[PDB]
Design a protein around this ligand. Sequence first.
Ligand SMILES: *C/C=C(C)/C=C/C=C(C)/C=C/C1=C(C)CCCC1(C)C
Ligand SMILES: *C/C=C(C)/C=C/C=C(C)/C=C/C1=C(C)CCCC1(C)C
Ligand SMILES: *C/C=C(C)/C=C/C=C(C)/C=C/C1=C(C)CCCC1(C)C
Lengths: 259, 259, 260
Amino acid sequence: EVTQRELFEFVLNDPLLASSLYINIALAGLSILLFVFMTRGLDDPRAKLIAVSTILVPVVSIASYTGLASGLTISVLEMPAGHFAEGSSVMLGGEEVDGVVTMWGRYLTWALSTPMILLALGLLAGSNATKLFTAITFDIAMCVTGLAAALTTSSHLMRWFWYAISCACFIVVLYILLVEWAQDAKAAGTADIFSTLKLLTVVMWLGYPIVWALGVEGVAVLPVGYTSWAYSALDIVAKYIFAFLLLNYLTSNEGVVSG
Amino acid sequence: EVTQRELFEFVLNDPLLASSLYINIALAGLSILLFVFMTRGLDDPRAKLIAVSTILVPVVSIASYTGLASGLTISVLEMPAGHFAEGSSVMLGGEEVDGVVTMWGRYLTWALSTPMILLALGLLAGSNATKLFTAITFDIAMCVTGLAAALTTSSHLMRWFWYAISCACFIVVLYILLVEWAQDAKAAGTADIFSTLKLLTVVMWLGYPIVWALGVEGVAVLPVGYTSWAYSALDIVAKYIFAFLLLNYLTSNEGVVSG
Amino acid sequence: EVTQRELFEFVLNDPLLASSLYINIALAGLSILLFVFMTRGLDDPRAKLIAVSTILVPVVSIASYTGLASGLTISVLEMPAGHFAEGSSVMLGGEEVDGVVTMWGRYLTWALSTPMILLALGLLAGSNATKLFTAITFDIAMCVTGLAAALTTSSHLMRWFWYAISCACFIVVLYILLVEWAQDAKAAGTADIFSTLKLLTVVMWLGYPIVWALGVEGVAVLPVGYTSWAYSALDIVAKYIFAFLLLNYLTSNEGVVSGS
Ligand SMILES: *C/C=C(C)/C=C/C=C(C)/C=C/C1=C(C)CCCC1(C)C
Ligand SMILES: *C/C=C(C)/C=C/C=C(C)/C=C/C1=C(C)CCCC1(C)C
Ligand SMILES: *C/C=C(C)/C=C/C=C(C)/C=C/C1=C(C)CCCC1(C)C
């Protein structure tokens, strides 16, 4: 009978875990303020659509980190036999319970933010509807199956099967990034900036599945505090710095992506 | 371990509460039928897009009220330390239980119905995609964070922090409603009706965050039965008569909204 | 009290229920490969929109069945007084638990795969955006209220009230398929194929509320293992062979639907 209150207090007392969360709550917030003033000059509906979806990324993030820091989107799950973290304890204060600290809150919200990054890139590269639809739907599938992976406590194999299904959807997104939109950006006349964000996106995302396999959800070698900082670190680049570069361009070349 | 049947029984047994839910199950159902009958004459696809988006509002409403009356989307939660309602008890049948009655089913479904209200209004006003995308996304972020606020029981401050994020998202919606679409409507030849609905929408929508703050979830000065009728009252205007007025216009001005 | 593992092991140790779930994880996966391979030569963006839409059906499906076999989207629920399955025991794990085995994960994912079946068909029929929006939102409403019906345990009358609402949403979808799109396909030059898939779709989809009614969720004349196999048999036709047939035509008539 673990309460939200114990999880909140649990996030505290553990400076490694606590800092990684609250730090982003503020970084996301400040990021929004900056982006709003940076795009005040835009007047082109198509140029402003690109900015709105870019700005929504940090918006989903503060909510995501707040949900986590609060204990709303965190849970104690008893891993299945054969699992490395199986047999673990946590102790939410004075009473220690069986299981591990599951921060499914991240996986859930990714289904919201990532489609937004993609919407941004896709529009920058003058993508057509079919390609946007394809990237976004498989991207969402990737996130939701990952969340199902983390919540599966009945069998060790099922958990990894989920992981596999998520990787397969990932390749579809990677494929449109590297191959499809890369070509479309040329006709749109944004291959320059597109190449930049594209290179950024792929590298950064590629790291999320890795941290997962290492952290308690997977092999369980990395501590929850480090895995959290890893993601927290990845989000900082995969989202905020990514948002700045894109917006910085949009304001300088509103005529390019106009129409 | 409160049961669903217990919350269902708790709704009945309480005249104020019972009537606020069951009356709207009937009004929304009657609204749907009336609205379908009123628009059976439309021919223009665009006019028809507006009519369906509008009819979906009471469709989501009847589902939402059934989810609450049946107890499926209600829960009894204990408020964090210092909350004005911490220490309250509810009493189900012959047993007394700690906590407050949280009708989170409303916050959740608003995420589906309010986007539809906005869809119909935006289109009626001749909005472009970028503004629709903006009103709608932040409208959803508003509803979702409001839900998070009602579901957060770990900290009193976290709750009001969720509420603040939600208010920020709300101003965005109000902005495009009061400024953006007010102008587009003139250009689309629908300023007369928009003005009536924009005024109705803004005044009514303002009432929800007030009701939330005054009820058990906030400073708890109003009983659960009172707060429920306040919302039901708002929905009757913000949803049903708002849809009647819009469809009555629509059915007499099919040509103007055609384009 | 009822753990996921107990549910995951209840499925296993019950040949019927297990096979009804694992066989479709396999069929769904084999369908994706086959469909991907079949659609390699497509080039027209609109033709490829219909293809990706169709392929997502079996993608949603493999994940769905994994969630049911893993026990992640299964629950034991107690039926309301008056329910023909009230007072039932599932005999979960070692103890005998009250209630019935509810596979709500099916209803949850339908809200994601059925809209894709509809996008493909609407597109194939050359439907405008208004009819597509109408069919899809009411389809989702139908799925969601069906899920709520199964998840409601407070009142027997409330369960059938959800069921009725959901049915009302269903007629909207059926009307768009049988009346609207049937005419639109004649203009899009896909009259025969759409009429064929329209009939396959209408016949199989009607099977669902019938199964729901006859199974544990309904009047309970069909045990859980049998209700599960009936759903799985319906999925094989309404999803996999349905997609197979649609893509078979598509890959031979890309020009007809090439449009924009
Ligand atoms: C702001 C967050 C971003 C950009 C997150 C990206 C996340 C991914 C690319 C996650 C991928 C995963 C897999 C491919 C396998 C299973 C587990 C996941 C969810 C970690
Ligand atoms: C049919 C329902 C309608 C029109 C609901 C409207 C709801 C709002 C405008 C809610 C706003 C809220 C805030 C601004 C602050 C936090 C709490 C909420 C969710 C009550
Ligand atoms: C891949 C799954 C398919 C094609 C599922 C189709 C499901 C339906 C047509 C369900 C309809 C239902 C009703 C009309 C009433 C209530 C219960 C349902 C959800 C079974």
